[PDB]
Design a protein around this ligand. Structure first.
Ligand SMILES: Nc1ncnc2c1ncn2[C@@H]1O[C@H](COP(=O)(O)OP(=O)(O)O)[C@@H](O)[C@H]1O
Ligand SMILES: Nc1ncnc2c1ncn2[C@@H]1O[C@H](COP(=O)(O)OP(=O)(O)O)[C@@H](O)[C@H]1O
Lengths: 249, 249
């Protein structure tokens, strides 16, 4: 019924700001791919990402990762209004600051240890006011973008100068840290975890609905397995990805 | 990269002030052997020792013992700046006082019971301001050198007169006593102990590094074996040789 067409999903393929979108319809939004696209968040936030094709993606939903999801303050199973517009405009020398408690990881040059490989050939569109994650050297850290000269967004190429700061600042507490564990930090591809998803979807992602309708949601759940098999991950990473408050007895 | 070339290591061969140094390069420092050499400590301290050759020493590191190590306030795995200079100048009648609580071991003549065999044919170079250990008669004790006429150091021969004092004085508490147990006081040549070395090297000899890098050092370690097999030695002698504070529950 003229519905937008966007659902949010975990993305198994491993990418910084890349999206899958269904082949059974490519003509409704009609994006050739690699074309800069809108993403509508909450509260007044938006994001920009690159799109690729998957035979094994659903006609239903959209593979996207944890850095895009946290920026938008979208969650799994959520829906974000989306719109294609193809256009993108280049930008300069994007500017960068440490975010939150994390820092001290880099001594001296910090764009040699971090930036060069990731902005290399990627054309990763990078926004004012978002956080992203660079991995390497046995540590991960995130660089906020406070000031970008062109706006609202800029595609990046290595024709531009390199400005440096490197001084930390406290990130807002309302934000959900990217080190707090979530679905991707749980490995094993057991698929059993998908079973806990079906149980905790409605009760703790949709509280008000159960006062409307008589049904019985499950009160308890036992995880069992020998020690070290990830039982505390599952709870931490269900509570983190659904926004519920995790307690610990 | 023009590195000095000195590393500090346990020395299994049994010697008062003798050092092994690698054959794969003898030409870089170029010491024929038996030649007085510098050793650079910390804080402003230095030492002098005699050098010998080992097929089974590494090109990497340097066999030296616990009396030299405590003087320098070097530790195992540490590195001390070193320099050859061949020269040595003779000295007189070196002067000697008891050190720390230990004493009362010798009644009357104390250089008959102690000195004569060890300064005999050795040419042991002996420093102002260091402690060394003489063994015999079911006890061990150490004689500080407060006053030596020639300086900075003197090689000794038995053409000189013998002065005696024998009255104790408190040794500085900051010092690490030579009776406190360490690697050599652990016997058995199990080589298993080498395994505990690999575990406790980085965590407790290099604390600041683990706040820089994400890794998990081991929190607990179980030693097990029937009683009397040296389990309390291992802990005492890991804590003593690494400088960590030993607690006891
Ligand atoms: N299946 C898994 N996938 C990814 N990481 C795991 C897995 N199992 C364990 N880990 C890692 O090892 C630890 C497992 O300990 P824990 O979460 O206490 O498991 P349990 O609750 O079963 O004792 C976690 O900190 C996690 O980082
Ligand atoms: N392998 C060994 N090498 C040298 N000395 C040992 C050894 N095992 C025991 N000893 C000596 O005997 C005692 C062993 O007792 P202890 O250290 O309490 O061992 P455990 O902790 O296994 O009971 C130590 O005081 C030590 O002096």
């Amino acid at each position: 019924n003229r519905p937008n067409r966007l659902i949010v999903d975990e993305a198994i393929n491993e990418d910084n700001s890349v999206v899958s979108l269904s082949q059974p319809k490519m003509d409704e939004l009609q994006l050739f791919r690699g074309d800069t696209v809108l993403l509508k968040g909450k509260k007044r936030r938006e994001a920009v990402c690159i799109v690729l094709s998957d035979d094994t993606c659903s006609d239903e939903k959209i593979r996207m990762n944890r850095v895009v999801r946290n920026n938008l303050r979208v969650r799994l199973g959520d829906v974000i209004s989306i719109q294609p517009c193809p256009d993108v405009k280049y930008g300069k020398r994007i500017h960068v600051l440490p975010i939150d408690d994390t820092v001290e990881g880099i001594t001296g040059n910090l764009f040699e240890v971090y930036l060069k490989p990731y902005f290399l050939e990627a054309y990763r569109p990078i926004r004012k006011g978002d956080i992203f994650l660079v991995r390497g050297g046995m540590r991960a850290v995130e660089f906020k973008v406070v000031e970008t000269d062109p706006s609202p967004y800029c595609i990046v190429a290595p024709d531009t100068v390199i400005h440096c700061e490197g001084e930390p600042i406290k990130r807002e507490d309302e934000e959900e840290s990217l080190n707090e564990v979530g679905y991707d930090d749980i490995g094993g591809c057991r698929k059993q975890l998908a079973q806990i998803k079906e149980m905790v979807e409605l009760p703790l992602r949709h509280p008000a609905l159960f006062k409307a309708i008589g049904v019985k949601p499950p009160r308890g759940i036992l995880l069992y397995g020998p020690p070290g098999t990830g039982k505390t991950l599952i709870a931490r990473a269900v509570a983190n990805e659904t926004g519920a408050f995790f307690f610990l007895i």
